[PDB]
């Protein structure tokens, strides 16, 4: 897989070029916000079980036919596979937040997941609702200042919200 820094080298090797001065200074900008990026992923993985079990509880109150008899999350194994998949999606999103790009999320989490859900009868549009519930439960927690020095890291939160949006549109 690639991270953000190794993505720039892969662009520069294919043109056979040394890196420029502006490409160096763009890379030293990602180093400067490294402590604010590490502080986000720490905020998300520390509450990772509560993101999943509360975004699921809001989903089954909004779409109550998923836990009625015949519903896709009705039995104890179908209920536990639903909480498994939300935890898998949230895990690879946390991986893509320290790397800087969605290379591990596309290859190791999303590849073939839409076709897996069609073959199962799992409603793929309902999985997208539960990922967007995990999106703003994580974004609202990443914007919480209790424990961090005060400052503006809103560009990083708009990047984390794009990994959740990437997995939400790649599941339906």
């Amino acid at each position: 897989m690639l991270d953000a820094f190794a993505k720039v080298v892969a662009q520069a090797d294919a043109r056979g070029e040394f890196l420029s001065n502006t490409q160096i200074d763009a890379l030293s900008k990602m180093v400067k916000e490294g402590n604010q990026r590490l502080d986000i992923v720490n905020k998300v993985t520390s509450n990772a079980s509560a993101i999943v079990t509360n975004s699921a509880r809001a989903l089954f109150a909004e779409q109550p036919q998923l836990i009625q008899p015949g519903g896709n999350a009705y039995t104890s194994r179908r209920m536990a596979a639903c909480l498994r998949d939300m935890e898998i999606v949230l895990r690879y999103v946390s991986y893509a937040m320290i790397a800087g790009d969605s290379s591990v999320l596309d290859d190791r989490c999303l590849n073939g997941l839409r076709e897996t859900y069609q073959a199962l009868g799992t409603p793929g549009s309902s999985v997208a609702v539960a990922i967007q519930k995990m999106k703003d439960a994580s974004v609202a927690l990443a914007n919480d200042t209790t424990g961090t020095p005060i400052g503006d890291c809103s560009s990083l939160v708009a990047e984390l919200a794009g990994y959740f949006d990437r997995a939400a549109v790649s599941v339906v």
Binding site: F5, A6, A12, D13, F18, L19, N35, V41, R91
Partner: protein, 162 residues
């Protein structure tokens, strides 16, 4: 590759686990080191044209038979001399790629993997490139912990050739 960031994701993903503080302490050591690695990668890039021609002239003094002996594998023709400095620039470019990524990631896929089949087939002696890399380690002009990061990936490429 072999970034410390991808080498921390690969251990957490093997267990099927989230990112604990074991991984965030690893990536923090990359960020506390990259202020010396990115000053070394910019200083080698801005002095590259002096370093390539100086290292290419150094192997002609150490091994003068390359500029005299006929054959396609020697720098006796203008075709062979342009392909010789091309190779020194390929070693210096992967060095500056390894400094901005951190760790010997880019030069593994791009330079080291399959290197022994190239030198065996086209009859290029790996002791020509060791003499060129020992010139860059001597006279890149750096000092302090900036020169420690540059010599760490010079000596990795020497260890694969030796």
């Amino acid at each position: 590759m072999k970034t410390p960031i991808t080498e921390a994701i690969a251990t957490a993903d093997n267990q099927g686990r989230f990112l604990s503080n074991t991984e965030l302490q690893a990536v923090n050591g990359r960020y506390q080191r990259a202020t010396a690695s990115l000053t070394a990668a910019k200083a080698l890039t801005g002095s590259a044209q002096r370093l390539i021609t100086g290292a290419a002239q150094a192997v002609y003094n150490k091994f003068p038979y390359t500029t005299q002996m006929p054959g396609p594998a020697y720098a006796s023709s203008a075709i062979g001399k342009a392909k010789c400095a091309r190779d020194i620039g390929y070693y210096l470019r992967m060095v500056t790629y390894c400094l901005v990524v951190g760790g010997t990631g880019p030069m593994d896929e791009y330079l080291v993997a399959g290197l022994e089949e190239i030198n065996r087939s086209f009859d290029l002696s790996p002791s020509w490139y060791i003499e060129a890399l020992q010139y860059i380690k001597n006279s890149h002009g750096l000092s302090g912990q900036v020169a420690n990061e540059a010599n760490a990936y010079i000596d990795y490429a020497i260890n694969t050739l030796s």
